[PDB]
Design a protein around this ligand. Structure first.
Ligand SMILES: C=CCO[C@]1(C(=O)O)C[C@@H](O[C@]2(C(=O)O)C[C@@H](O)[C@@H](O)[C@@H]([C@H](O)CO[C@]3(C(=O)O)C[C@@H](O)[C@@H](O)[C@@H]([C@H](O)CO)O3)O2)[C@@H](O)[C@@H]([C@H](O)CO)O1
Ligand SMILES: [Mg+2]
Ligand SMILES: [Mg+2]
Ligand SMILES: [Zn+2]
Lengths: 222, 219
């Protein structure tokens, strides 16, 4: 039952600082080196640094790419890992992962968090407009019917979209956001049996953490 | 220092076939003290965190399917997947831990499958959007293969390319298809000057485009 959960990601201005956390459970935290790894959107993983285990004095090492600018620390009472980032630049925009590292013997990163997305930008936070995508004038004799959610004009990434609180997973396609004029837009489609809608409800659940936006948009016919 | 390089950058393989992937280190990763190569492989499926597959070059982590095998030594390493499955779609990264840690640049594995025609759906602007002065028309092109596809928007029969943004999903982990969204954004004022809105998809699966349309008067 190993759990690693990063937090702290979001929008920060160039030259700014931001500290990420990684809450852990399910293993003896002090036995383990812990690493941070980042990934710019669409690019490769980059190892950033580690903090050693108790047996090795909890000392730190860093990639030359961030040494002197990023600081790793750990709270061994609560099993939390930290990454302090200073003098941030656009090139630091990335998903940041914490990973469980060396235990003095094994050479492997056994477990990784879900990642937290950091955006370095001067653009302002903007909540999404969420619009329902319901069929126009064309009966779905197609046995199946496709509905959607348009999540328009937000910044920064990410947003999350689910359908019926996650009950509908299969037949869902959420399209990667496209950036236009300092704003992202994405859409999500869901395809369900025509016998289930609109007799049953279909709702897209959209969250935009940067603006604490929470939207539940029911897709209504007519 | 230690440079990790992977090959190929990307490739596609059909389900059931063998996949071979390479990782080179700028210096040997064979630790003389322990006599092991400090080289691990990670799988990152689309939208997911990396997952450990193999470490010490050839040790398969518990729970990893037997079809994944790491091999090699010193400066050259290989990840082989036999009987590849649709679910194996991912970027694969190697990583040295001989001196700190460094990742390779990844190998993107896509899944080749039989050609499949898109299912096309068109959606008019919502009243909620129109009320604020905008009009986005959305077209979903779902479950097609290969990824290459053309979408044309016609308004009252005339092609429009201005204000069109497209987005492809990554390949689906179950059926190996792609989907794409095409969104045409207009002002309400311009939207209300025309009647017919059409999304036309042309895909190698048919010489006939798939045409979906709606008429504003029918809303
Ligand atoms: C002056 C130090 C000598 O240390 C060694 C030696 O280098 O010959 C290794 C040392 O091994 C162990 C240990 O404490 O038993 C176990 C080994 O697995 C490692 O944990 C090492 C070190 O902690 C180094 O590990 C790291 C590191 O922290 O930089 C991390 C590893 O993932 C890996 O990258 C290694 C790298 O392979 C270098 O070792 O670096 O400690 C121990 O065997 C001593 C011995 O007591 C004599 O001094 O020798
Ligand atoms: Mg699909
Ligand atoms: Mg007209
Ligand atoms: Zn016009």
């Amino acid at each position: 039952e190993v759990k690693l959960v990063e937090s702290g990601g979001g929008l920060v201005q160039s030259g700014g600082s931001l500290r990420l956390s990684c809450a852990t459970s399910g293993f003896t935290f002090t036995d383990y080196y812990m690493s941070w790894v980042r990934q710019p959107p669409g690019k490769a993983l980059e190892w950033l640094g580690f903090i050693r285990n108790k047996a090795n004095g909890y000392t730190t090492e860093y990639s030359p790419s961030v040494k002197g600018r990023f600081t790793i620390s750990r709270d061994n009472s609560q099993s939390i890992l930290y990454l302090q980032m200073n003098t941030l630049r656009a090139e630091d925009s990335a998903t940041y992962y914490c990973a469980r590292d060396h235990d003095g013997y094994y050479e492997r990163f056994s477990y990784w968090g879900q990642g937290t997305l950091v955006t370095v930008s001067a653009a302002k936070t903007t909540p999404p407009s969420v619009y329902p995508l319901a069929p126009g004038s064309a009966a779905q004799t197609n046995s199946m019917v496709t509905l959607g959610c348009l999540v328009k004009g937000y910044f920064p990434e990410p947003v999350t979209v689910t359908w019926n609180s996650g009950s509908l997973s299969s037949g869902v396609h959420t399209f990667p956001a496209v950036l236009q004029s300092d704003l992202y837009t994405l859409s999500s489609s869901v395809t369900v049996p025509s016998s289930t809608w609109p007799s049953e409800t279909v709702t897209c659940n959209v969250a935009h953490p940067a603006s604490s936006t929470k939207v539940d948009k029911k897709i209504v016919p007519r | 220092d230690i440079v990790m390089s992977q090959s190929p950058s990307s490739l596609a393989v059909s389900a059931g076939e063998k996949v071979t992937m390479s990782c080179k280190s700028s210096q040997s990763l064979l630790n003389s003290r322990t006599r092991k190569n400090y080289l691990a492989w990670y799988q990152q499926k689309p939208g997911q965190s990396p997952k450990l597959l193999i470490y010490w070059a050839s040790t398969r982590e518990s729970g990893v399917p037997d079809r994944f095998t790491g091999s090699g030594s010193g400066t050259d390493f290989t990840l082989t997947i036999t009987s590849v499955q649709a679910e194996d779609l991912a970027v694969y990264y190697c990583k040295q831990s001989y001196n700190l840690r460094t990742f390779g640049g990844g190998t993107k594995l896509e899944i080749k499958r039989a050609d499949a025609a898109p299912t096309v759906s068109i959606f008019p602007p919502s009243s909620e959007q129109l009320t604020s002065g905008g009009a986005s028309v959305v077209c979903f092109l779902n479950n097609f293969y290969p990824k290459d596809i053309n979408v044309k928007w016609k308004i009252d029969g005339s092609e429009r390319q201005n204000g069109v943004l497209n987005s492809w999903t990554d390949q689906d982990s179950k059926d190996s298809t792609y989907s794409m969204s095409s969104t045409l954004t207009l002002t309400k004022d311009e939207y209300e000057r025309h009647n017919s809105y059409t999304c036309e998809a042309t895909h190698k699966t048919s010489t006939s485009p798939i045409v979906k349309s709606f008429n504003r008067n029918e809303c």
